[PDB]
Amino acid sequence: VNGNATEEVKVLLDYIHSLDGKILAGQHSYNENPSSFYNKAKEISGKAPAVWGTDFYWNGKDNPGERIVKEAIDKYHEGAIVTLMWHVGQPKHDPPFSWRESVQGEISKKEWDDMLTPGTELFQRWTQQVDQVAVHLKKLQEAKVPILWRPYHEMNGVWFWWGNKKGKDGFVKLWKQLYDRLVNHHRLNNLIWVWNANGPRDIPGDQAYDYKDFYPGHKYVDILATDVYHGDYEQKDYDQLVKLAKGKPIALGEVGQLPRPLVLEAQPKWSWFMVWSNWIETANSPERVKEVYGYDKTITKDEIQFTNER
C-alpha cells in the first residue's frame, strides 16, 4: 500500500503472495529474551521457524527497543522473516505500562477523541510514545530489514484500551493517524502493514466484534491477520476474513494450539502462523509440533527461497 516501499518489502510481499497453499512456521518470544521461545521451537521441532516475532511492549524499567533491534537484525541476517507488535499503555500514562491498569485500562470517549485531535495534550503525548518506537523501526530500515508490522492488534476485542472503538472516529482513525506518522512523518518505507484482529466471539465480558467494523480500508492495510487460541479454527471465521481481505494475504497472527494438517487443507489461505511464546509447549504436544512443522506445506527457515534467487 506504500508507493515508496523498499525493495526488501516488495520482495517479501511478492513471496507471501506466491505461497498459494504453503504456510510459514512462526514463533513469538517476549522481548526480555527475544529469541528464547524461537530457540525452544527449534529444539522441539528440529527446525528453526521461518518467522521470528517479538513485541515493543515497554513493561519493565528500560526501553526494550535497542535489544529488540539487535536481535531482529541478527535473525534477519540468519534468514528469518521478522514480525513486530506493540503492546502499549494509554497516552495519559508513562512507561513502564501496567498490563491491567494501562494496556487493558479504561479510556473515556473524550480521552480517545483528544488523542486523535492535533493540539491536545493527549495527542502530543501519543506522538511521543509513537516516536519511542519509530526510532527503532528507522534503525531497522537502515539495516534493510522489512517488518511484518502488527500495531494495535485484537482491536475488535473489548479488553485493550484501543479495542471496540466503532465508527468513523473510532479505531480506523487511530490506524490512519499511526500510518501517517510512521510512513509520512518518519518516512518508514520498510513496513508491511498487518491489520491483526481477534477471532470474533460473544462471550459476556470478553466479546470480540465483527472484523469489518474496525477495518480502515485497503489503502492502509497490506495483510489481514487474526488470533486463534484453543484450536478454534472455525471455517466461518476464515470465510469472514477472506471476504474482507478481497485478495490481500491473510495470516494467523497469533495461535496457541497449532493448526492441524486437516485444518490447513481446509484453510489453505493462511500465510503464516505465530505461536505465542511458551504455548509451543503448554498448548501443543511435541508430536503435534513435529506433525505441523513436518507437514509438506509448512515452510521453515531453511526452506525460504525467494524466486529471484533460484
Task: Give the C-alpha Rg.
Answer: 18 Å
Oligomeric state of the chains present here: monomer
Could you say how many structural domains there are in total?
Answer: 1
User: Rough shape?
Assistant: globular
Number of separate helices: 11
Q: Decide which structural class fits the backbone.
A: alpha/beta
Order of strands in the sheet with the most strands? 1-2-3-4-5-6-7-8
Strand content: 15-25%
Model description:
By secondary structure, the chain is of the alpha/beta class. The protein has one domain. It has eleven helices and nine strands. The chain has helices at residues 7-17, 36-45, 65-77, 99-103, 109-115, 121-142, 171-185, 235-245, 261-266, 279-282, 286-293, and strands spanning 23-28, 51-55, 81-85, 147-150, 191-198, 223-228, 250-255, 270-276, 298-299. Helix 9 (261-266) links the parallel strand 7 (250-255) and strand 8. Helix 3 packs parallel to helix 6. The relative contact order is 0.17.
Descriptive keywords:
11 helices; alpha/beta; eight-stranded parallel β-barrel; 9 strands; 310 residues
Topology:
Elements: H1 7-17, E1 23-28, H2 36-45, E2 51-55, H3 65-77, E3 81-85, H4 99-103, H5 109-115, H6 121-142, E4 147-150, H7 171-185, E5 191-198, E6 223-228, H8 235-245, E7 250-255, H9 261-266, E8 270-276, H10 279-282, H11 286-293, E9 298-299
Parallel strand pairs: 1-2, 1-8, 1-9, 2-3, 3-4, 4-5, 5-6, 6-7, 7-8
Helix pairs in contact: 3-6
PDB class: hydrolase
Keywords: GH26, glycoside hydrolase, hydrolase
Assembly: monomeric
